[PDB]
C-alpha cells in the first residue's frame, strides 16, 4: 500500500 | 457515398501513489466523450502506466486504477458508454522516460488513450 | 494533452443526357452535401473527372468529357462559392467505361462525372 | 458537333 520519488 | 476516419491520442498524468484525475486533464476527457459521441463506432484503448517506484504488486494494481479513473470520468462525468471502453495497467514495463530523474518518472505516471472509428 | 484527426473520403456521381453537360436538378441535393463537407473540411481537396460512352467523334468526346467535368465544378465554384483553386477537372472521352456501352442502360452509366473528395481537419 | 445511341 505504500512509491516515493 | 462518404466516410471520416477519427483517430484520437488522449494524455493524461498523475501524481505519486495517485490515480485521481486533475482538473487540467478534465477539459481534454471531455473532448474526447464529445468526439465519441459523433463517431459511435469509435471505442476507446485506455492504458495505465506507473514509474518504476514501489513495489511492483501495488504498482499494477494502480496503473489499471489509472486507466479505469480514465474511463469512469468517461463514463460517469460524460456520459460515454463504457462498453465502448477497454482498460489495461502496464506498472513500470513501458516507460516513456527515464525513471532515474523527477521528470522523466511525472511522465511514466500516465494513462494513454487512443481513439479510433469511423463513421 | 491530445491529439485528434479526422479524414475524409468521399465520391459524387453525376451523370448526363447524350451530348449534354448540364447538371440536371436530379443532382443539386447531391451537390450541396459536398460543397458543406468542403466547408467542414478547410483542407480537403477534389478530384472531377469526366467521361462519355462511345458514341461520336473522339474529339467531340474529349471536350464533352472534360466540359461535364467543369460543369460540376462550376455548381460548387459559382453556386457554392467554392475555392476553385480545390477542384481539379479532367476528361477521359470513352476511356474508362463503367458498363456496357451495347446498351442503352450501359450509356447512361458511362455518360458522368466521378468526383473524388479527400482531406483532413 | 453532331452522338447518337
Ligand atoms: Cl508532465
Ligand atoms: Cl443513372
Same mark, same amino acid.
Given at each position: 500500500?505504500?512509491?516515493?520519488? | !457515398?462518404?466516410?471520416?476516419?477519427?483517430? &484520437?491520442?488522449?494524455?493524461? /498524468? /498523475?501524481?505519486?501513489?495517485?490515480?485521481?484525475?486533475?482538473?487540467?486533464?478534465?477539459?481534454?476527457?471531455?473532448?474526447?466523450?464529445?468526439?465519441?459521441?459523433?463517431?459511435?463506432?469509435?471505442?476507446?484503448?485506455?492504458?495505465?502506466? @506507473?514509474?518504476?517506484?514501489?513495489?511492483?504488486?501495488? $504498482? !499494477?494494481?494502480? *496503473?489499471?486504477?489509472?486507466? $479505469?479513473? %480514465?474511463? *469512469?470520468?468517461?463514463?460517469?462525468?460524460?456520459? %460515454?458508454?463504457?462498453?465502448?471502453? *477497454?482498460?489495461?495497467? /502496464?506498472?513500470?514495463?513501458?516507460?516513456?522516460?527515464?525513471?532515474?530523474?523527477?521528470? =522523466?518518472?511525472? &511522465?511514466?505516471?500516465?494513462? /494513454?488513450?487512443?481513439? @479510433? =472509428?469511423?463513421?
Amino acid at each position: 500500500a505504500x512509491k516515493x520519488x | !457515398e462518404l466516410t471520416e476516419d477519427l483517430n &484520437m491520442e488522449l494524455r493524461v /498524468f /498523475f501524481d505519486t501513489n495517485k490515480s485521481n484525475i486533475k482538473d487540467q486533464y478534465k477539459p481534454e476527457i471531455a473532448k474526447v466523450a464529445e468526439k465519441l459521441s459523433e463517431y459511435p463506432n469509435a471505442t476507446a484503448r485506455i492504458e495505465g502506466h @506507473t514509474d518504476n517506484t514501489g513495489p511492483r504488486k501495488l $504498482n !499494477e494494481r494502480l *496503473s489499471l486504477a489509472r486507466a $479505469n479513473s %480514465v474511463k *469512469s470520468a468517461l463514463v460517469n462525468e460524460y456520459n %460515454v458508454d463504457a462498453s465502448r471502453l *477497454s482498460t489495461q495497467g /502496464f506498472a513500470w514495463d513501458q516507460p516513456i522516460a527515464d525513471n532515474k530523474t523527477k521528470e =522523466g518518472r511525472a &511522465m511514466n505516471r500516465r494513462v /494513454f488513450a487512443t481513439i @479510433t =472509428g469511423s463513421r
